[PDB]
Amino acid sequence: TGTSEMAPALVAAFGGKENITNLDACITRLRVSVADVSKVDQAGLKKLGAAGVVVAGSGVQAIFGTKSDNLKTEMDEYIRN
């Protein structure tokens, strides 16, 4: 096991804490509102497990399947604490 660093890795892929303004997850998607889409590493998100990544407005949606809700929660926890 060890210590998971998935939350910080995802936050880094999305451009860092200063780039994230909102976090939401559905059943198949992780929706992250960002201040700057150009700071998001779409390829990095796929390497992290995203089946696909779509830029829609000031948001980036990443398909992490059934894990989406869990990653969302871990991201918020890492951002807050």
Whichever domain contains 33, its CATH number is: 3.30.1360.60
Range of the domain at 18: 1-81
- What is the number of residues in the chain? 81
Do 42 and 22 form a contact (C-beta atoms < 8 A)?
A: no
Q: How far apart are CA 29 and CA 63, in angstroms?
A: 4
Is 55 among the catalytic positions? no
**The one catalytic residue among 26, 51, 54, 55:** 26
Elucidation method: X-ray
Structurally, the chain folds into a number of domains equal to: 1
Q: How far apart are CA 38 and CA 41, in angstroms?
A: 8
Do 66 and 26 form a contact (C-beta atoms < 8 A)?
A: no
Alpha-carbon distances of 1 from 4, 68, 75, rounded to whole Å: 8, 21, 19
Which structure tokens are listed for 38? 């150009």
Residue partners of 2: CB distance under 8 A and separation at least 6: none
Three-state secondary-structure class, residue 72: helix
* Range 47-79 burial, b when 16+ CB lie within 10 A, else e: ebbbeebeeeeeebbbbbeeebbebbebbeebe
